[PDB]
Design a protein around this ligand. Structure first.
Ligand SMILES: O=C(O)/C=C/c1ccncc1
Length: 274
């Protein structure tokens, strides 16, 4: 069973992740996303509770699979001779944060607060399940427009979470920390916080703060839009040059700028026009 089980639709995305199609589960007309990954382009693999050799991506997705709606749910997968096919949940209507920001410019702080908070809950969920996403960015975040709920997608650059140093990286350079640029070394959590600082800046300014390696290393933050003093403080904190000067997830969520977040649904009512 595979072709009879899913009705394949139009292509959604095409990148370093691969080829993702809109789909419909023939069983109950459920909206799905059908992701194809070529074996030759897969650089690291693991194994399941019993399992054969599957892509790390599948390992990581199964580990964060649950009722929690903050991380994309892997519903099924198939192995073909030269590829793996991932059946993922698809919200509907949906828009990714990159497209959302492109369309609307810098986000109001209240909306950025709601979105960032949900990103924080989702990443914490990953870390708790032993999974490090390592490609946190606007493109890897879907917005369920009706419910006001965000979903982390694309675990294709991820790894098991560990407390020892990482010497490999294949996420997005412009979201990577100065210790990666300068040394090819990072730790998971502190590097995740850095990329979260980039994302937050992206939300409130409508573009990322650094384009080139030298800017990343210099770590000097210029605000191109009006941003409140506390948000600027949180952003600069996440983007501290020294990894150990960065806030913990707890400190991020305790920060004064993070107080009084909207519920996702209150968020959709106010900012998503539902
Ligand atoms: O996990 C991914 O790489 C992509 C997931 C996804 C889910 C719904 N729509 C588009 C992409």
């Amino acid at each position: 069973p595979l072709e009879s089980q899913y009705q394949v639709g139009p292509l959604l995305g095409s990148g370093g992740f691969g080829s993702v199609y809109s789909g419909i589960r023939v069983s109950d007309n459920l909206p799905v996303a059908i992701k194809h990954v070529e074996k030759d382009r897969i650089s690291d693999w693991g194994e399941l509770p019993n399992g054969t050799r599957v892509p790390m991506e599948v390992v990581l997705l199964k580990k964060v699979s649950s009722g929690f709606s903050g991380v994309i749910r892997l519903l099924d997968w198939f192995e073909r001779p030269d590829s793996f096919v991932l059946i993922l949940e698809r919200p509907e209507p949906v828009q990714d944060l990159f497209d959302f920001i492109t369309e609307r410019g810098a986000l109001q702080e209240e909306l950025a607060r709601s979105f960032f908070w949900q990103v924080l809950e989702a990443v914490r969920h990953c870390h708790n399940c032993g999974v490090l996403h390592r490609d946190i960015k606007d493109e890897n975040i879907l917005i369920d427009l009706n419910r006001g709920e965000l979903k982390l997608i694309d675990f294709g650059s991820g790894a098991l979470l560990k407390d020892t140093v990482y010497t490999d990286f294949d996420g997005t350079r412009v979201y990577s920390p100065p210790e990666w640029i300068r040394y090819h070394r990072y730790h998971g959590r502190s590097a995740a916080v850095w990329s979260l600082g980039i994302l937050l800046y992206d939300m409130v300014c409508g573009d990322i703060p650094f384009e080139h390696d030298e800017e990343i290393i210099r770590g000097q933050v210029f605000f191109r839009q009006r941003v409140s003093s506390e948000c600027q403080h949180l952003i600069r904190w996440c983007l501290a040059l020294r990894p150990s000067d960065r806030p913990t997830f707890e400190e991020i969520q305790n920060h004064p700028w993070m107080q009084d977040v909207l519920l996702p649904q209150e968020t959709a009512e106010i900012h998503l026009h539902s």
